[PDB]
Structures are given as structure tokens and as C-alpha cells.
């Protein structure tokens, strides 16, 4: 599913991402835009042989099982295929565990390089939330 900006904003707010660990909703929408272009079916292979899955490009090295990432872990206890659903629940529940892990949203390199320090409220402009 390719979400619209305000459809994703609304889905992330309902699932409790707005101000989760102090990250305002625009941070999460900005991250999704640059990780996946709001595409739930987005997959990207990393140099280390891990893969990133879904709207928030969650990595198979630590967080989900795809059965082809050596000496990986599955800390969110889910197959990486569950991160590609039209329903963002499994992505949101894994993102909450990632962002609690210690370095907050710096875990998403695209957030650090493209969103961090920018006017992220622009991402939720005109949205009926
Ligand atoms: Cl915001
Ligand atoms: Cl990740
Ligand atoms: Cl694996
Ligand atoms: Cl599995
Ligand atoms: Cl959803
Ligand atoms: Cl933080």
C-alpha cells in the first residue's frame, strides 16, 4: 500500500507514535517519506547482507527474521514479511522498541541526515488529525 502523507500521519497517531519518546509526529512522517516514500512494500538490501523492510525500513540484523541474515537476531519477534502489510501495526510496535533502544531516532540514518533539526511540522501541514 502507498499511503498519502495525511493518511500515514493519521495511522501513526492512532498507533501512538505522536510524541513517543518525545518525537513529534512530523519526525515519524519525515522518516517514512525518506525511508520508504510511504510504501509499505519497500525492501532494500544493506551492504552487510541484512535487509530493511516496510514503511520504516526495519533491519533484519536485529529486529525481524527473514531467514537469510547470519548471526542476526529477531528482537521484535516477527517475520520481516509482517513489516510489508497494508496495516502498519507490526511496523509501529517494532519502531517503538528501536527508538527506546538508546540512540532514539538516530537509529534511522535517513532521519539523522534528512529530518533531524529541520522544520518537521511541515510534514503534518493541512492534516485533519
Ligand atoms: Cl511535528
Ligand atoms: Cl531499523
Ligand atoms: Cl536469519
Ligand atoms: Cl519467523
Ligand atoms: Cl494501519
Ligand atoms: Cl531521544
Swiss-Prot record:
One of its GO terms (cellular component) is extracellular space. Its EC number is 3.2.1.17. The keyword Hydrolase applies. Residues 1-129 form the C-type lysozyme domain. It catalyses: Hydrolysis of (1->4)-beta-linkages between N-acetylmuramic acid and N-acetyl-D-glucosamine residues in a peptidoglycan and between N-acetyl-D-glucosamine residues in chitodextrins. Gene3D superfamilies: 1.10.530.10. PANTHER family: LYSOZYME C. This is Lysozyme C.
